[PDB]
Amino acid sequence: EVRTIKVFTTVDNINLHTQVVDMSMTYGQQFGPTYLDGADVTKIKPHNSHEGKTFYVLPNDDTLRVEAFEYYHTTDPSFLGRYMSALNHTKKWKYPQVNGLTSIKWADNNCYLATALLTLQQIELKFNPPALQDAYYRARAGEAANFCALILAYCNKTVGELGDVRETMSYLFQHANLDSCKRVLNVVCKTCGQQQTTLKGVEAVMYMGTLSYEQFKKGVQIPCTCGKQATKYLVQQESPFVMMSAPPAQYELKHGTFTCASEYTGNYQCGHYKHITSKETLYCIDGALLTKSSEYKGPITDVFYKENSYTTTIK
Ligand SMILES: Cc1ccc(N)cc1C(=O)N[C@H](C)c1cccc2ccccc12
Ligand SMILES: [Zn+2]
């Protein structure tokens, strides 16, 4: 016998293609790799209840490969599989509204995603792939499963693998409109002289050395090839924000002096991230848990500061 039902196949969940499927054959035998809300149904055969639902298929024709690229801004043929793999787990996460922000309830080493999400809700970042733009707007409302699964997909991470926030944000900043972001630094050695350097894009809003945006304006000590301590200071900053990073060290966060910060407790590649945010007072957002305080000491590895345009007054 041959009975059939009507389903929708997609790569983006915007352009739905209308397929008639043989129920006496599998989804894998008809389309190839097929996913329903993340779940791999390749070896599964069609069911009565499946009639009228949307299924993600691999872009295995010239039409779907163009729709895929235009949406995800990647031609990596493993991408959709790794997104669907991740999504299948992240749809079972709880996304509670903590301090009027979308956070994640701890599960499968997602502490770094939770702080990365809370950060992205607080800084002005414009994503280029329509996939992230769409997923993020849902994430703000509290439907963050599609966003988290994309972050894991874009960053080449499996569910349960702890990730570096600075490494994660770097990846996402590649897929962000940071075009007109500009940074001018002046390095001054007492023997060698002066050196100015201009940085455009992701390079302009990321520094690895110090957490203090004040110290980066005042000046920081760096080893010149002279074998003498040279001073590097910020001449000019043109960006919606700056991300100051350093390896985890005991640091004092003062109310008003920053936007948000990533606290890391534990040892390399096996610790625990928490989100510290500055509002009417300091709040520590620990996944679904929330503590507030006036003062804060702790092992901070990232601070994010808002910006528009800065020009130095050092001579
Ligand atoms: C969580 C994670 C996942 C993947 C990778 N590749 C790295 C990390 C990670 O350890 N990050 C923290 C902030 C860190 C960074 C730099 C130096 C550190 C030295 C000592 C302790 C922590 C340190
Ligand atoms: Zn020198």
Decide: 19 and 9 in contact? Cβ < 8 Å.
yes
286 in catalytic set = yes
Residue identifier of the C-alpha nearest atom 21 of ligand 1: 268
In the DSSP assignment, the letter for residue 202 is G
Q: Please, which residues bridge with residue 231 across strands?
A: 188, 221
Q: Which of 111, 152, 262, 268 to mutate to test the pocket of ligand 1 (most atoms within 8 A of CB)?
A: 268
Do 196 and 230 share a domain, yes or no? yes
In the DSSP assignment, the letter for residue 46 is P
Specified resolution (Å) = 2.5
**Each residue of 121-134: b (16+ CB within 10 Å) or e?**
bbbebebebebbeb
Interval between CA 145 and ligand 2 midpoint (Å): 50
99/101 Cα distance (integer angstroms): 5
Torsion of the alpha carbons at 190, 191, 196 and 201, rounded to the nearest 10: -90
Q: Which amino acid is residue 200, in one-letter code?
A: K
Ligand 1 close to Cβ of residue 155 (< 6 A) = no
Do 132 and 94 share a domain, yes or no? yes
Do 15 and 77 share a domain, yes or no? no
Do 186 and 307 share a domain, yes or no? yes
Give the number of whichever ligand sits closest to the CA of residue 271: 1
Structure tokens belonging to residue 152: 């894991």
Do 295 and 245 share a domain, yes or no? yes
Do 186 and 303 share a domain, yes or no? yes
Q: Which amino acid is residue 194, in one-letter code?
A: Q
Do 122 and 164 share a domain, yes or no? yes
Do 10 and 64 share a domain, yes or no? no
Question: For residue 260, which of 236, 284, 288, 238 has the smallest C-alpha distance?
Answer: 284
Structural domain ending residue among the three candidates 34, 57, 80: 57
106/111 Cα distance (integer angstroms): 6
Do 177 and 199 share a domain, yes or no? no
Structure determined via? X-ray
Structural domain ending residue among the three candidates 181, 215, 246: 181
Do 307 and 228 share a domain, yes or no? yes
SS3 77: coil
243/148 Cα distance (integer angstroms): 21
250/233 Cα distance (integer angstroms): 23
Residue identifier of the C-alpha nearest atom 14 of ligand 1: 247
Catalytic hit among 89, 111, 175, 181: 111
Sole residue written with tokens 């809370």: 118
In the DSSP assignment, the letter for residue 38 is T
Atom of ligand 1 nearest to the CA of 264: 13
For residue 180, CA distances in Å to 28, 199, 205, 305, 309 come to: 45, 11, 11, 18, 12
Give the number of other Cβ atoms within 10 Å of residue 284's Cβ: 19
- Treating both helix axes as pointing N-terminal to C-terminal, what angle do 111-120 and 165-174 enclose, rounded to 10 degrees? 50
38/85 Cα distance (integer angstroms): 6
Sole residue written with tokens 């350097």: 197
111 in catalytic set = yes
For residue 52, CA distances in Å to 7, 32, 36, 127, 161 come to: 5, 19, 12, 31, 35
Total structural domains within the chain: 3
Ligand 1 close to Cβ of residue 262 (< 6 A) = no
Interval between CA 215 and ligand 2 midpoint (Å): 20
In the DSSP assignment, the letter for residue 2 is -
Give the number of whichever ligand sits closest to the CA of residue 195: 2
Structural domain ending residue among the three candidates 181, 216, 236: 181
Do 187 and 314 share a domain, yes or no? yes
6: domain range? 1-57
Do 35 and 127 share a domain, yes or no? no
47 in catalytic set = no
SS3 136: helix
Contacts by 132-135, CB closer than 8 A, 24 or more apart:
132/172, 132/175
SS3 155: coil
